[PDB]
Ligand binder design. Structure first.
Ligand code: BEF
Ligand SMILES: [Mg+2]
Length: 880
C-alpha cells in the first residue's frame, strides 16, 4: 500500500477525509464508489460445464458414438450398458472436484464485525461491512481489527499478525513514521485486517475495505483455485488421446476393407451386408479398445490409498491426491507449527554459577545453590494452564511454566507459595514489568525485560550469594552469552528480582533502579521430535526439501541448519528480496534458494508456481492461513492438525496428529499406488488389445467376428474388473523408496511395461484366433463361442503373468496375493454363469456347445498364459 512509507498526519490528506469525524454523506458517497467491506465468492457452480467437461475426455466420445451406432443396429441392451457406465464414469469425476473448492466461508468467519467507529463526531459501533476508507476506527485489546490501516494514535497496543506473518506473538505498534521500504511483516506504523489486538488501545485510519486488503489478496489467490492435473490424470489423458486416435483410425480401416471385398466378389457382393458388417466390426472394436472399467477400477485402487493413510491419522478428501504424493520431487514446508509445534520451550539457560549442558531432572535432584531464578521466573510470567491444559496468554511467557512442568515441578506449587499483588503496568517503553514480592519478612520487586535494555538499569550481580555490582568479567560475559544465543537466534530474556522498595504502599516509576538480576534464559520454538528423520528420509528418496516461512531470518536460518535442509554455509533471502526479483533470474536462483524467510502469502504461491514451471511436481505443507494460497496452487496441499480451518479446507490432505513422519511415509505409499495402477491398467489394457487382434484377423480372413456386443462389454466392465483391482492390491517393493522421483513427462507404460503389454496382448489374441479357426471348421456359431471362451479365460489367467512384468508367478509368491487368486476363481465362476442354460443364448453360445469344444478353447487360453510366463524370463530387458 506504500502507506507505511508515508507519514502519519500526511496520510489523512490523501484520504481527503478528516481524522476527527466522518459525516453521513461521507458514508453514502464513499460506499457508492468503494462498496461495502465484504467478500462474496464468485463461483457460478452451474454444473452444466462439469457434466459436459466429461466429454472433453476422448475416452468418452468414442463410447457415445459406439452406443449411438449400437442403438440403430437393434442392439438396445448392449447400448444401454454403455450409457450406464458412461454416467458412472461421469459422476465420479464431477464430484471429484466439486469438493475441491476453497471454503471462502471459513475465511468469512474472520470478518470480525461490530467495530467501534467515530461517525458524525459521535462514538458509535456498526458492523464491519459498513466500513469505508477515510473512516476513524477505535481498537481496544480483545477485539479484532475490521480492516487494515495506519494508526494515528498508539496507546502502546500490540497486535497478533498471525494470519499474515505466521508468528502468534504480540508485536509492538508505533505511531512514528518509518521513512523506509521494508517488508510486509514489519509494518510497525500501520495495522492489518483479521488480527487480534492483544494489548493496548489505539485509533486508526483504514486505507481499504475487504477488497484489495491483505486478506483480500489471500482471497484472490484462493479464488483462482486452479490445481494442476495430477500425474495420473496428466499421463492418463495424454494416453487417452493416443487411445482415442486408434478408434478413428480403425473405423476408417474397417469401412475401407469391407468395401474392398465388394470389388473382387463374384457377381459383386451384397452392398448393405458389407456396410452393416463394417458397422458390427466397428462397434466390436470400439467397445473392446476402451477399458470402460478403468475409471471404476482406478477409483478403487485409490480406494486403498487414504484407507492405508487413515490408520496414521492422515485424512485425504480428494482421492486423486494420493498418487500425486508419489511423483513429488520438491517438498515445501512451513516453519511455525509445521516443522515445530508452535510451543515455546527452553533449550539452554545461563546462571552466574551453574550452567549444565542439559537441564536437570527434578527440583529434588540437582540441588545446586539457591534457584532464585527458578523461583522468580514463575512469578514474573502472566500465563495460565487450565484444567484442560490448553495454552492461553502470550506465547513467550508460557515458556517459563511449560519448561517448569517438564522438570517435575508444578506450575501451582510455586505460584501459590508466594503471593504477588503488583501494579502490573504496560510495557510501552523499556519493556519493563514490576511486581510486589513477599519472601519471609522482606520485600522485593521482580522485574523482567530484554537483555539489551534490562542490563542498562542493572546495578547488581551475584553468584553463590550476593555479589553486588561488578564491571569486568560481568558486563563482558553477559554480552558473550547473549550474543552467542542470538547467533543461535534464541529469544533471551532477563529477570531480576529487585528488592529495592520495602513495605511501600505502591511501586513507583522512579524506584525501578538498583536492579539485581538473577539469570538469563534462551527460549526458542523448537522443531518437532519427528522432523529430523523426515529430512534424511526425503533426501535419500530423491526429494528436495525447501522451507518457506514468514518469520525473522535469524530463527528461520538457524532452524534448518540443525535439521540439515540447507548446507552448513548457505544463505536465505527476505521477502523484500523476492518483491524485487523478476522471473527471469528467479528460475536460475530457484535451484539454490535453499530456505526462505520473512515471505508474504503471495511469495509462497510464487515459489510453488515457479517450481511447477521448472518441471518438478511439488507439494506444500503448512498450518496457518498464510499457506492456503500455496496449498490450493500446489499439486496437493497438506495441512496440520492444529492448523486453522482455512488451510484445512484449502488442502487435499489433512494430517491430524502433527506427526511429520507421516509425510515421507506418504510418498512411499504414493509411488506404490501408481506402481500398482501401472501394472493394473497394463493388465486391463493388454486384454483389450488381444480382443482387437482377434477381431481384425476375422476381418482380413472374412470370418464372423469372434466376439459380439454385450459380450466384450461383459468381459470389460464385469469380468476383468476384479483381477485389475486384485493386481492393485499387490505388495510394495523395498526398492521403491530409493528410486528417483518418477518424472511427470514419462508415459504410463514407460519403463519396460509397454513391451510386456504388447507381448501378453499378442498372446491372448493369437490363442483366440486359433480357437475361432477350430470352431469355424465345426460351425460358424461355434467359432464365436470358442473364441469368447479363450478370451474370457486368457484374460482371467493373465493375472498370474501380469502380477509383475519382471518376475514369474512361481517364485514371487504364487499364493501370496489372496486377492489375485480370489479373482481368478471368481472369474472362473463369472464364466461359468455363461454356460448356464438360461444365459447360454444371451451370450451367443450355441446349443451344440459341448465339453470337448470347451476343452479345446480352454487349453488354448491356458497355453496363452503359459506362453506369457515363459516369455517373461526370455530377456535382460524391462529393467529401468
Ligand atoms: F508458520 Be509458517 F512459517 F508460515
Ligand atoms: Mg505456520
Amino acid at each position: 500500500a506504500e502507506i507505511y512509507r508515508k507519514s502519519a498526519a500526511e496520510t489523512f490528506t490523501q484520504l481527503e477525509a478528516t481524522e476527527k469525524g466522518l459525516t453521513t454523506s461521507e458514508v453514502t458517497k464513499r460506499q457508492e464508489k468503494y462498496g461495502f467491506n465484504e467478500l462474496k465468492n464468485k463461483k457460478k457452480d452451474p454444473l452444466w460445464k462439469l457434466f459436459l467437461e466429461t466429454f472433453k475426455d476422448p475416452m468418452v466420445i468414442v463410447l457415445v458414438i459406439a452406443a449411438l451406432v449400437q442403438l440403430v443396429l437393434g442392439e438396445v441392451v448392449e447400448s444401454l450398458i454403455i450409457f450406464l457406465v458412461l454416467i458412472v464414469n461421469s459422476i465420479i469425476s464431477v464430484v471429484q472436484t466439486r469438493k475441491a473448492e476453497s471454503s471462502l466461508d471459513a475465511l468469512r468467519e474472520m470478518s470480525a464485525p461490530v467495530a467501534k467507529v467515530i461517525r458524525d463526531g459521535s462514538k458509535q459501533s456498526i458492523h464491519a461491512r459498513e466500513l469505508v476508507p477515510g473512516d476513524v476506527v477505535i481498537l481496544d485489546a480483545g477485539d479484532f481489527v475490521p480492516a487494515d490501516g495506519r494508526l494515528f494514535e498508539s496507546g502502546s497496543l500490540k497486535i497478533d499478525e498471525g494470519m499474515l506473518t505466521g508468528e502468534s506473538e504480540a508485536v509492538e505498534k508505533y505511531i512514528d513514521t518509518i521513512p523506509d521500504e521494508v517488508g510486509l511483516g514489519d509494518r510497525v506504523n500501520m495495522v492489518f485486517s483479521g488480527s487480534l489486538v492483544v494489548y493496548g488501545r489505539g485509533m486508526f485510519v483504514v486505507t481499504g475495505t475487504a477488497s484489495e486488503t491483505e486478506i483480500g489478496k489471500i482471497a484472490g489467490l484462493l479464488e483462482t483455485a486452479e490445481a494442476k492435473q495430477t500425474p495420473l490424470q496428466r499421463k492418463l489423458e495424454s494416453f487417452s488421446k493416443k487411445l482415442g486416435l486408434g478408434i478413428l483410425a480403425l473405423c476408417v480401416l474397417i469401412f475401407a476393407v469391407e468395401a474392398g471385398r465388394v470389388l473382387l466378389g463374384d457377381n459383386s457382393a451384397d452392398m448393405a451386408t458389407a456396410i452393416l458388417n463394417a458397422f458390427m466390426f466397428a462397434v466390436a472394436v470400439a467397445v473392446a479398445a476402451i477399458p470402460e472399467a478403468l475409471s471404476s477400477i482406478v477409483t478403487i485402487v485409490l480406494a486403498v490409498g487414504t484407507n492405508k493413510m487413515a490408520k496414521q491419522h492422515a485424512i485425504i478428501r480428494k482421492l486423486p491426491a494420493v498418487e500425486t504424493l508419489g511423483s513429488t520431487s520438491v517438498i515445501c514446508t512451513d516453519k511455525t507449527g509445521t516443522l515445530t509445534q508452535n510451543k515455546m520451550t527452553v533449550v539452554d539457560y545461563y546462571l552466574p554459577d551453574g550452567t549444565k549442558e542439559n537441564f536437570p531432572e527434578s527440583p529434588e535432584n540437582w540441588s545446586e545453590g539457591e534457584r532464585r531464578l527458578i523461583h522468580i521466573a514463575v512469578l514474573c510470567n502472566d500465563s495460565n494452564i487450565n484444567s484442560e491444559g490448553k495454552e492461553l496468554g502470550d506465547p513467550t511467557e508460557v515458556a517459563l511454566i511449560a519448561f517448569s512442568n517438564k522438570n517435575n515441578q508444578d506450575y501451582n506449587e510455586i505460584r501459590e507459595k508466594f503471593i504477588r499483588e503488583g501494579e502490573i503496568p504496560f510495557d510501552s517503553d523499556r519493556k519493563l514489568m514490576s511486581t510486589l514480592h513477599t519472601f519471609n519478612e522482606n520485600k522485593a520487586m521482580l522485574t523482567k525485560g530484554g537483555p539489551d535494555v534490562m542490563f542498562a538499569r542493572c546495578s547488581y550481580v551475584f553468584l553463590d550469594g550476593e555479589e553486588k555490582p561488578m564491571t569486568e568479567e560481568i558486563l563482558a560475559k553477559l554480552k558473550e552469552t547473549n550474543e552467542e544465543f542470538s547467533n543461535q537466534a534464541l529469544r533471551v530474556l532477563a529477570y531480576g528480582y529487585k528488592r529495592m522498595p520495602a513495605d511501600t504502599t505502591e511501586l513507583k516509576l522512579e524506584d525501578e533502579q538498583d536492579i539485581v538480576l538473577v539469570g538469563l534464559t534462551a527460549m526458542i520454538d523448537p522443531p518437532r521430535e519427528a522432523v529430523y528423520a523426515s529430512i534424511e528420509e526425503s533426501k535419500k528418496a530423491g526429494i528436495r526439501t525447501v522451507m518457506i516461512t514468514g518469520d525473522h531470518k535469524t530463527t528461520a536460518q538457524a532452524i534448518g541448519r540443525d535439521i540439515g535442509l540447507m548446507d552448513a554455509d548457505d544463505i536465505a533471502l527476505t521477502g523484500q528480496e523476492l518483491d524485487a526479483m523478476p522471473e527471469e533470474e528467479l528460475d536460475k536462483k530457484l535451484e539454490h534458494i535453499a530456505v526462505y524467510a520473512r515471505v508474504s502469502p503471495e511469495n509462497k504461491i510464487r515459489i510453488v508456481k515457479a517450481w511447477q514451471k521448472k518441471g518438478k511436481i511439488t507439494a506444500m505443507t503448512g498450518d496457518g492461513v498464510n499457506d492456503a494460497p500455496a496449498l490450493k496452487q500446489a499439486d496437493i496441499g497438506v495441512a496440520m492438525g492444529s492448523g486453522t480451518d482455512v488451510a484445512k479446507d484449502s488442502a487435499a490432505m489433512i494430517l491430524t496428529d502433527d506427526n511429520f513422519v507421516s509425510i515421507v511415509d506418504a510418498v512411499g505409499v504414493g509411488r506404490t499406488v501408481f506402481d500398482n495402477i501401472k501394472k493394473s491398467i497394463a493388465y486391463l489394457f493388454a486384454g483389450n488389445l488381444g480382443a482387437i487382434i482377434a477381431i481384425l484377423f476375422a476381418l482380413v480372413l472374412d470370418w464372423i467376428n469372434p466376439f459380439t456386443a454385450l459380450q466384450l462389454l461383459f468381459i470389460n466392465l464385469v469380468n476383468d474388473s476384479l483381477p485389475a483391482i486384485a493386481l492393485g492390491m499387490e505388495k510394495a517393493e523395498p526398492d521403491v523408496m530409493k528410486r528417483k522421483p518418477r518424472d511427470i513427462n514419462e508415459g504410463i507404460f514407460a519403463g519396460g511395461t509397454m513391451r510386456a503389454v504388447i507381448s501378453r496382448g499378442v498372446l491372448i489374441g493369437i490363442a483366440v484366433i486359433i480357437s475361432q479357426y477350430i470352431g469355424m471348421q465345426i460351425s460358424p456359431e461355434m467359432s464365436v463361442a470358442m473364441a469368447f471362451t479363450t478370451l474370457i479365460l486368457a484374460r482371467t489367467l493373465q493375472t498370474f503373468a501380469a502380477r509383475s512384468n519382471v518376475q514369474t508367478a512361481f517364485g514371487a509368491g504364487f499364493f501370496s496375493n489372496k486377492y489375485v487368486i480370489g479373482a481368478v476363481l471368481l472369474c472362473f465362476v463369472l464364466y461359468g454363469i455363461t454356460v448356464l442354460p438360461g444365459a447360454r443364448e444371451i451370450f451367443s453360445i450355441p446349443a451344440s456347445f459341448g465339453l470337448h469344444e470347451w476343452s479345446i478353447a480352454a487349453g488354448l487360453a491356458l497355453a496363452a498364459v503359459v506362453m506369457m510366463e515363459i516369455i517373461k524370463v526370455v530377456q535382460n530387458k524391462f529393467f529401468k
